[PDB]
Design an enzyme around this catalytic site. Structure first.
Site, short mmCIF file in Angstrom:
data_model
loop_
_atom_site.label_atom_id
_atom_site.label_comp_id
_atom_site.label_asym_id
_atom_site.label_seq_id
_atom_site.Cartn_x
_atom_site.Cartn_y
_atom_site.Cartn_z
N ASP A 656 0.83 -1.21 0.00
CA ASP A 656 0.00 0.00 0.00
C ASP A 656 0.88 1.28 0.00
O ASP A 656 2.08 1.20 0.26
CB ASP A 656 -1.06 -0.02 1.12
CG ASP A 656 -0.51 0.11 2.53
OD1 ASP A 656 -0.31 1.24 2.97
OD2 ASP A 656 -0.35 -0.92 3.20
N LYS A 725 -2.04 8.89 12.16
CA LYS A 725 -2.35 8.18 10.92
C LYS A 725 -3.87 8.09 10.72
O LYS A 725 -4.37 8.40 9.64
CB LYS A 725 -1.65 6.80 10.86
CG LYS A 725 -1.98 6.03 9.58
CD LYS A 725 -1.13 4.79 9.32
CE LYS A 725 -1.68 4.01 8.14
NZ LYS A 725 -0.89 2.77 7.84
N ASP A 862 -7.13 -0.09 1.15
CA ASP A 862 -6.00 0.73 0.68
C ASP A 862 -4.96 -0.16 -0.09
O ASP A 862 -4.18 0.37 -0.87
CB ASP A 862 -5.35 1.42 1.94
CG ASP A 862 -4.60 2.76 1.80
OD1 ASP A 862 -3.40 2.81 2.16
OD2 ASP A 862 -5.27 3.79 1.51
#
Ligand SMILES: [Cl-]
Ligand SMILES: [Cl-]
Ligand SMILES: [Cl-]
Ligand SMILES: [Cl-]
Ligand SMILES: [Cl-]
Length: 941
Positions: A656, A725, A862
């Site tokens: 990713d 994050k 993702d």
């Protein structure tokens, strides 16, 4: 554009052609034409629907009456009106003179003969009859031969469709005969419309109470079946009286299925209803979905369509079969179409007002008829102010004490036992018999689906093929992982390892685990396929909700690729690097330092695989533990093989972009600072955007804590990589929608030393700070986020929902409206949704290019997934496709589109001019060379 009342009138007539209730339709057509105010409601498509029906029966006089009715309303016969007249003459075998006179009237207007069979959609029985009537004039049929399907010629998709023999398409590991068996197993499953599965919940031997709960349950179910059947009969007669009175009613729609099959369906809805309840609107949609789905199955079953599909699918399997070979390399959608695909005519779902009106009736019928002694089974409760239906709490406990050893699911809610049907259009593909839409979103579905059908023909090929490819990945259950999850599940659970314990939202998570685990146990020795869907912005999802590769760490760990690939010279290193990635340790380390750590920790990798619960339990401390364990096990098998390079690996390995969206902002704005931070610029070590962002959040936090702000004060030391994050994800992708933000609340709850009183207030503060931080540090993010927000704010204030087209030709439309556009949601959602469409575009290009190179490619959120053997090839394609996507003038083309679409408004001329001003002020890109990405190790890792 057809009224709601007009939409239902046409659907009523259309339905009567299926139910053989043509006098009922004709009566309504006569009545409405009888009332001067109602004549206006009658469309030419309505009269034709009534004329088509008569033609099929061969009732000439009744059809001729409808022709005279068309004239009297002041209308002109189209191609369809002439198709019915010819079908009627064809069926009854009429004289040459009578047919020629109708044919003379046709060309006089004039309508083209050859245009009738091509343009107008007519069934096989319809076309052959219309052909036999023209044949009475002894032609010279000279019907144009099969025109070859066109290919997509767009810059980005050109190489995917180019007939240059630089292709090596992957076949499945299974032979034709095996694959043919599996198709029958799936067809059998789909024809029954229900799948019965053994419950994995430990069954206690029938006690004095279990026998009694099951006995009480049988009598209620016996009572309800007779109660519903009588309620259905009474409403069918009541709605029939309405038709005879010349008013619309849902009567023909209740005649599509057998009364016993509607009751069975309503009973299995009652049974599958969650203890926590479901929303009435969703239940209405679910009953109409189940009514239509079953109707379409029954129609195909009797029309001889099943055998035609059986023949077609068996010929199609040659392209996928291990033992078979196709004349020339081909794509699944292309091959399915080339064979001679019988376009599933029954496509036509009922319009939204018909869909809702039917669903409501069925739901309120299920509520009124069902009762139990302690009176009705279901109750109407209003919550976020949305109407919900919750069951009786004694009935829920009655189901608990019964402990039914069997679980039943709708065939369409479980994985496919055979490769899915290729997506050939927005309304065809996935399941064998059941209808599935390419776009899943409910809000403003009619408006989007229309847009996808309004498309130039080849425009959707990229998205259609990628979704076909995602669905074509063969899966199987990781048995060792399942066995361990079941030991924990079957013995009070293990919430520390994400295994739900028995009994607030305890029942919802436990039952979701119970359904999923029971399906995994059912499929444990089977190969299965997950057909895929798309939401409005292009995010891909498997169609079956219960068992998927999607969800949690535990759900992801339960699956592996059915087909394996020998590790080769680098597979083992990739398996070890992947294991390390899953631990969440080593994020700031380069690839070779991650590989080194795996060797250093190899004894713990083997001890985790050999005795997961009773050894050192090193895997348990991983960020993604079940996936780490599944990886420890794979590493252990490979190292113990006769030669590790020849070991056939089934474990998917993931890559990713960390925050894929910030990579798009960096590339869109050619921001070197942004590009460096998210690994667009090559580097020997990965870059952490979250480190820079956390520092930025800290300087702002320090100031608010230096002032009176308690939230900022209480967050000192809690500005972690994990917290930041999640906030970056929320800010980049959140529409609002508390989705990403509730995940922020989770990460703070995991921080034991943080005051759990501040959790909700802090999540809002962190979003505020991260948003301010991202704008401060990155020019691309700042200018593009601001431009998209403003354009959307203006488009919405003029009274339109924002709409665009992806660089791959996929139309996108934001559906947010007020219960009139929702201005706040339209402007806040445009940057996240636009970013979601670019992630979609990139993944689709990667999938499509990997397929050409013979790789197995799947997208799970993702992440990009492949076999350990093919990671580098997937990464190479990944980098190449990002550079290709971003080399196109994305922002300029979006601006061009938005001006053409939203700036021609002569009632809002100044606002349109002001909007054109903002739209044409496209953010100017920086100095960043996009070609660097192809040389970046950490771009995808
Ligand atoms: Cl079976
Ligand atoms: Cl079955
Ligand atoms: Cl059946
Ligand atoms: Cl294999
Ligand atoms: Cl190195």
């Amino acid at each position: 554009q057809l009224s709601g009342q007009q939409q239902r009138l046409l659907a009523f007539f259309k339905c009567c052609l299926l139910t053989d209730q043509l006098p009922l339709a004709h009566h309504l057509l006569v009545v409405h034409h009888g009332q001067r105010q109602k004549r206006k409601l009658l469309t030419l498509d309505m009269y034709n629907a009534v004329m088509l029906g008569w033609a099929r029966q061969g009732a000439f006089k009744e059809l001729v009456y409808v022709l005279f009715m068309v004239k009297d309303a002041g209308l002109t016969p189209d191609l369809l009106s002439y198709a019915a007249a010819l079908q009627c003459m064809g069926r009854q075998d009429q004289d040459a003179g009578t047919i020629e006179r109708c044919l003379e009237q046709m060309s006089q207007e004039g309508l083209k003969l050859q245009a009738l069979f091509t343009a107008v959609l007519l069934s096989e029985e319809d076309r052959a009859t219309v052909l036999k009537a023209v044949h009475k004039v002894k032609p010279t049929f000279s019907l144009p031969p099969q025109l070859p399907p066109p290919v997509n010629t767009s810059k980005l998709l050109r190489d995917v469709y180019a007939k240059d023999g630089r292709v090596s398409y992957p076949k499945l590991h299974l032979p034709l005969k095996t694959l043919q068996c599996l198709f029958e197993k799936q067809l059998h499953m789909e024809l029954a419309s229900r799948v019965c599965v053994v419950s994995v919940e430990k069954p206690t031997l029938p006690s004095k109470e279990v026998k009694h709960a099951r006995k009480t349950l049988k009598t209620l179910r016996d009572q309800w079946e007779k109660a519903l059947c009588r309620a259905l009969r009474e409403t069918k007669n009541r709605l029939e009286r309405e038709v005879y009175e010349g008013r619309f009613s849902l009567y023909p729609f209740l005649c599509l299925l057998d009364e016993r099959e509607v009751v069975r369906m309503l009973l299995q809805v009652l049974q599958a209803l969650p203890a926590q309840g479901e929303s009435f609107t969703t239940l209405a949609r679910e009953l109409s979905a189940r009514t239509f789905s079953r109707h379409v199955v029954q129609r195909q079953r009797v029309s001889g369509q099943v055998q035609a599909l059986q023949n077609h699918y068996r010929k199609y399997l040659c392209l996928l079969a291990s033992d078979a070979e196709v004349p020339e390399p081909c794509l699944p959608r292309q091959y399915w179409e080339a064979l001679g695909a019988p376009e599933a005519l029954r496509e036509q779902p009922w319009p939204l007002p018909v869909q809702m009106e039917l669903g409501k009736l069925l739901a309120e019928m299920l509520v009124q008829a069902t009762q139990m002694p302690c009176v009705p089974v279901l109750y109407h409760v209003y919550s976020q102010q949305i109407g919900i239906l919750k069951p009786h709490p004694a009935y829920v406990q009655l189901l608990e004490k019964a402990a039914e050893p069997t679980l039943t699911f709708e065939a369409v809610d479980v994985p496919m036992l055979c490769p899915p049907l290729p997506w050939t259009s927005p309304h065809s593909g996935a399941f064998l018999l059941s209808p599935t839409k390419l776009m899943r979103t409910v809000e403003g579905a009619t408006q989007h689906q229309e847009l996808l059908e309004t498309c130039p023909p080849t425009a959707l090929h990229g998205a259609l093929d990628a979704l076909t490819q995602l669905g074509n990945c063969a899966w199987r259950v990781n048995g060792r992982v399942l066995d361990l999850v079941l030991q924990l599940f079957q013995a009070k659970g293990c919430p520390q390892l994400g295994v739900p314990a028995p009994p607030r939202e305890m029942h919802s998570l436990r039952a979701e685990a119970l359904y999923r685990l029971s399906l995994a146990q059912h499929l444990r020795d089977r190969v299965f396929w997950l057909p895929h869907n798309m939401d409005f912005r292009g995010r891909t999802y498997p169609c079956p909700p219960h068992f998927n590769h999607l969800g949690s760490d535990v759900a992801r760990a339960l699956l592996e690729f059915a087909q394996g690939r020998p590790l080769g010279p680098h597979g083992l290193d990739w398996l070890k690097i992947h294991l390390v990635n899953l631990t969440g340790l080593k994020k700031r380390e380069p690839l070779r330092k991650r590989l080194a750590f795996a060797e250093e920790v190899m004894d713990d990798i083997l001890d985790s695989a050999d005795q997961p619960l009773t050894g050192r339990k090193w895997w348990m401390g991983a960020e993604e533990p079940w996936q780490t364990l599944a990886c420890c096990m794979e590493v252990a098998n490979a190292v113990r093989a006769s030669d590790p390079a020849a070991y056939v690996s089934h474990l998917p390995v993931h890559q990713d972009g960390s925050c894929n969206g910030l990579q798009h902002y960096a590339a869109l704005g050619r921001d070197s600072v942004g590009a460096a931070s998210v690994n667009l610029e090559p580097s020997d070590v990965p870059q952490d955007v979250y480190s820079g962002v956390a520092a930025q959040v800290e300087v702002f936090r320090r100031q608010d804590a230096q002032r009176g702000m308690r939230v900022a004060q209480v967050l000192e030391g809690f500005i972690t990589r994990k917290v930041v994050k999640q906030t970056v994800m929320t800010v980049v992708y959140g529409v609002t929608r508390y989705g990403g933000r509730l995940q922020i609340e989770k990460r703070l709850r995991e921080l034991s030393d943080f005051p759990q009183e501040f959790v909700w207030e802090a999540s809002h503060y962190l979003v505020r700070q991260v948003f301010k931080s991202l704008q401060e540090m990155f020019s691309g993010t700042r200018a593009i986020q601001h431009w998209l927000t403003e354009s959307a704010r203006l488009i919405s204030h003029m009274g339109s929902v924002v709409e665009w087209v992806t660089p791959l030709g996929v139309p996108v439309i934001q559906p947010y409206r007020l219960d009139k556009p929702n201005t706040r949601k339209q402007k806040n959602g445009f940057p996240p949704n636009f970013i979601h469409s670019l992630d979609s575009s990139h993944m689709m290009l990667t999938a499509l290019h990997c397929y050409r190179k013979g790789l197995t490619f799947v997208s799970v959120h993702d992440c990009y997934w492949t076999h350990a053997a093919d990671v580098s090839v997937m990464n190479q394609v990944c980098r190449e496709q990002f550079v290709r996507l971003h080399s196109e003038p994305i922002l300029q083309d979006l601006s061009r589109f938005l001006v053409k679409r939203f700036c021609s408004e002569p009632q809002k001329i100044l606002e349109a001019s002001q909007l054109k001003e903002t739209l044409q002020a496209v953010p100017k890109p920086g100095a960043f060379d996009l070609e660097q990405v192809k040389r970046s190790t950490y771009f995808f890792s």
